């Protein structure tokens, strides 16, 4: 219908003064130019019942025309070994061994390990086609020579595969052998599995120089231009310790390799140990070590799963940092993307007099308007306002390109996520084609559900622009930091401000952010938790690539569940599932935490008997005690909706917490989260169980500070209702005018 013709992304989410952000734009075809100009975002939701879309143009050193061009995106996980001198193409015999686990053994043609050119049929490769393992060599003149396995592969079974080329007998060979044990495969030792073969064909040509890189989980597309080898036929599933020899192996050698014994350790040409570099800090690196001393070090591209269950994994250890000899596999999905690697179009250095707020680069193509959001910080070590707003960028990466048609209202930016999956990537709420959910996500790709325009739930950036619009419609003076900046800077960022407001959906945190919030509130600090599902999942930012996020989920409010031995993060060797299971529940920091969720509409708040208290006479200052709080708004038509938090002393709510109001009129579609169920039994729904509620709370910390928790998502959505004159806005304004004073927050 509408044809999205222009894209783009930043290299980094937030930029302070005096440093440069680079914008990487692409179009569907190379013709024409595109406009660009900087704007300041104020209100994102273009709902006709609300304030409407609001922006503000900035005279900067950015505007002008730039050449539109199409930029190709590599798409799929693999391991690329740089080989300029063609050492991995032997002049005589050679042999290849690897371990194999396949999730989609019948999805087209899939290359496993290769130094292959595909435009001209030259080099060697080990591949999967017609559900069989095929070992092919070629000369460059189109003629090939293949040997093909007899027994096809089963899905998700560990195989030991040995491809053998032997010019002395002019004979190719291929030894396939299944290595299942009790724990590592899809089924166990009770099957009469007959999946072994030993075949032979006739080598009629000689294997030439492909002039490419050696690839694991892929075939090379064409010859190497500018040192980049494009990968086409991607593999789906684990590969464990490949190796190339310089001699034709026998059946006894294949049998000894299939038990894990390194035969002829001086005849090796290369041996890539995928488990080399696992310390007590995980393995936060992309360097694949050549474990045979030849300098053929690889490099993981588009982030396959480091620290995955190997072929020899009995389940006596499940933490991969304490048993690295059983975690030598990499998953290699066909549809990963951590960086588009695009070439730069224009860059922008932040000037001196530029206020810290939300910005965007508005790119105008022919008939398509596009935005690229980013954030501008206060200058480093300075605090130009008494209010800080934490943009929840880790949850922006969580729901980035959250594809629904690939997985209900749709705009034109959802059918383009569906029609072009190779340009955009997937989300952590989605899953791969294999059945495993997506763990790694990334900023350096065009996030298409982040653009500010377009009754149900809203995307996460307009849901924070609700708070930005409410702060600009009043007279409050604020700054903007992000959760990456909170992660990098600690509580030193938070101690420069009086009150710190939290974004609309701060669901995924790091451990260091939780430590920063606890150290800030513990020593005379103030905050507003204007949201819910507040600190549920544990994220770790990748240490080499700070634009790559990681989450490995478990049971709970999930969409996917991690496979059994693979709970521990690879960026740090720590457990990291949900926060509540690490004895760090959300109530222990912010006073309330996750209780229920659902998807139809919102409720309203009924006041509790602590509303009439005189310790909180400053909160309920202009509200009659017979009124509803948030009955009607932009998000569901209410203030308590879609996800709810509760008060619980056993999970760690501080003892001096007052309980102001609570939400009612929730449908039977609101379920109890699986963390609170002992035995599931009927009646675990909203309106029928006590745990389905929101709870507006307040506790006071030491040294004159405290915390206010509204415990619902749609609270920010119901701020502009009835033109800023409602109970939600007056309550938020009362608490915020109390917190930005110089007197201590009351007890």
């Amino acid at each position: 219908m509408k044809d999205i013709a222009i894209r783009g992304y930043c290299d980094r989410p937030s930029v302070a003064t005096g440093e440069t952000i680079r914008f990487y734009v692409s179009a569907n075809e190379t013709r024409g130019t595109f406009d660009a100009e900087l704007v300041r975002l104020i209100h994102g939701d273009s709902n006709p019942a609300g304030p409407g879309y609001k922006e503000e143009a900035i005279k900067s050193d950015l505007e002008g025309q730039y050449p539109a061009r199409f930029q190709r995106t590599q798409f799929g996980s693999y391991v690329e070994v740089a080989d300029p001198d063609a050492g991995l193409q032997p002049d005589g015999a050679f042999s290849v061994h690897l371990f194999l686990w396949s999730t989609t053994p019948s999805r087209g043609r899939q290359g496993i390990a290769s130094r292959w050119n595909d435009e001209r049929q030259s080099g060697w490769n080990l591949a999967i086609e017609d559900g069989r393992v095929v070992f092919t060599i070629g000369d460059g003149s189109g003629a090939t020579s293949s040997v093909v396995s007899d027994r096809p592969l089963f899905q998700q079974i560990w195989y030991s595969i040995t491809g053998v080329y032997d010019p002395e007998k002019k004979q190719l060979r291929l030894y396939q052998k299944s290595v299942v044990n009790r724990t590592n495969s899809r089924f166990g030792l009770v099957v009469p599995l007959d999946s072994d073969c030993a075949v032979s064909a006739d080598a009629t040509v000689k294997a030439a120089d492909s002039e490419t890189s050696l690839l694991i989980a892929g075939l090379g597309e064409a010859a190497a231009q500018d040192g980049r080898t494009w990968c086409i036929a991607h593999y789906n599933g684990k590969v464990d310790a490949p190796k190339i020899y310089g001699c034709a192996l026998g059946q006894d050698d294949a049998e000894k390799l299939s038990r894990g014994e390194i035969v002829r350790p001086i005849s090796r040409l290369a041996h890539w140990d995928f488990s080399a570099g696992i310390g007590l800090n995980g393995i936060p690196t992309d360097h694949v070590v050549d474990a045979s001393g030849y300098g053929h070090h690889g490099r993981c591209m588009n982030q396959p799963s480091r620290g995955s269950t190997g072929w020899n994994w009995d389940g006596h250890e499940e933490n991969f940092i304490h048993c690295p000899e059983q975690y030598g596999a990499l998953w290699f999905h066909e549809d990963c993307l951590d960086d588009c690697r695009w070439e730069k179009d224009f860059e922008f250095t932040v000037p001196e007099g530029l206020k810290s707020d939300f910005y965007a680069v508005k790119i105008r193509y022919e008939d398509t308007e596009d935005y690229i959001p980013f954030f501008v910080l206060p200058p480093r070590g300075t605090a130009t306002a008494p209010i800080l707003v934490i943009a929840s960028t880790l949850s922006y990466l969580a729901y980035a390109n959250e594809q629904i048609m690939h997985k209900p209202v749709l705009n034109e930016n959802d059918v383009e996520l569906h029609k072009n999956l190779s340009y955009y990537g997937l989300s952590t709420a989605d899953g791969h084609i294999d059945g495993r959910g997506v763990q790694y996500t990334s900023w350096r790709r065009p996030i298409m559900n982040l653009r500010p325009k377009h009754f149900g739930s809203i995307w996460e950036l307009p849901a924070d622009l609700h708070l930005i619009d409410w702060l600009n419609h009043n007279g409050f003076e604020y700054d903007v930091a992000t959760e990456h900046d909170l992660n990098d800077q600690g509580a030193e960022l938070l101690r420069r401000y009086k009150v710190v407001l939290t974004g609309s959906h701060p669901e995924y945190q790091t451990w260091a952010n939780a430590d920063a919030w606890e150290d800030y509130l513990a020593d005379g600090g103030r905050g507003m938790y204007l949201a819910a599902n507040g600190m549920y999942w544990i994220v770790e930012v990748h240490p080499e690539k700070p634009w790559v996020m990681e989450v490995r989920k478990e049971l709970g409010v999930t969409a996917w569940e991690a496979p059994p031995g693979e709970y521990h993060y690879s960026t740090n060797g720590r457990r990291g599932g949900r926060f509540r299971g690490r004895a760090r529940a959300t109530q222990k920091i912010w006073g309330t935490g996750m209780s229920s969720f659902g998807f139809d509409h919102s409720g309203y708040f009924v006041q509790m008997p602590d509303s009439q208290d005189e310790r909180v006479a400053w909160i309920m200052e202009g509200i009659d005690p017979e009124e509803r709080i948030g009955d009607g708004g932009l998000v569901g038509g209410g203030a308590g909706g879609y996800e709810l938090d509760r008060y619980d002393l056993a999970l760690g709510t501080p003892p001096n917490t007052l309980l102001l109001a609570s939400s009612v009129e929730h449908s039977v579609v609101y379920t109890v989260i699986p963390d609170d169920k002992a035995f599931p039994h009927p009646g675990m729904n909203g309106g029928e169980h006590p745990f389905v509620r929101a709870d507006i709370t307040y506790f006071s910390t030491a040294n004159g500070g405290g915390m206010f928790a509204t415990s619902s998502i749609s609270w920010l959505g119901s701020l502009s209702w009835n033109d800023y004159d409602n109970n939600v806005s007056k309550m938020t304004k009362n608490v915020l005018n109390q917190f930005i004073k110089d007197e201590p927050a009351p007890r």
Partner: protein, 119 residues
């Protein structure tokens, strides 16, 4: 300063009182609008080969999760052929029942008497 544990109470109990209030009102309205659920429950209390009404299942979901559900056990011994209904030492009752379906329906009637006899 948070120094004494007796100065602080569990403040969610106020919400539990409010919630039980509204829930008791809704259940007595559901019973007084559909009185045939007592006839249905006297017919077959286990729901054996006739799954209950949605309103009767809503009544059972209210009954099977209160803190007051912990009363009303059906008691019998090896040499009686009789079912008596205990009430929390437990206070055994007077009426004897020859099946446990009659005892379960009497327990259900007595829980309806309890939910009426509070508000």
């Amino acid at each position: 300063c948070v120094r004494d544990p007796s100065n602080y109470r569990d403040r969610s109990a106020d919400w539990y009182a409010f919630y039980d209030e509204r829930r008791r009102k809704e259940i007595i309205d559901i019973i007084d609008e559909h009185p045939e659920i007592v006839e249905e429950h006297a017919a077959n209390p286990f729901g054996y080969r006739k799954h209950p009404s949605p309103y009767l299942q809503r009544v059972h979901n209210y009954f099977r999760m209160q803190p007051t559900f912990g009363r009303y056990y059906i008691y019998s011994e090896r040499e009686w052929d009789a079912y008596r209904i205990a009430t929390i030492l437990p206070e055994l009752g007077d009426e004897r029942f020859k099946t446990e379906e009659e005892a379960m329906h009497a327990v259900f009637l007595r829980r309806i008497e309890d939910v009426r006899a509070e508000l």
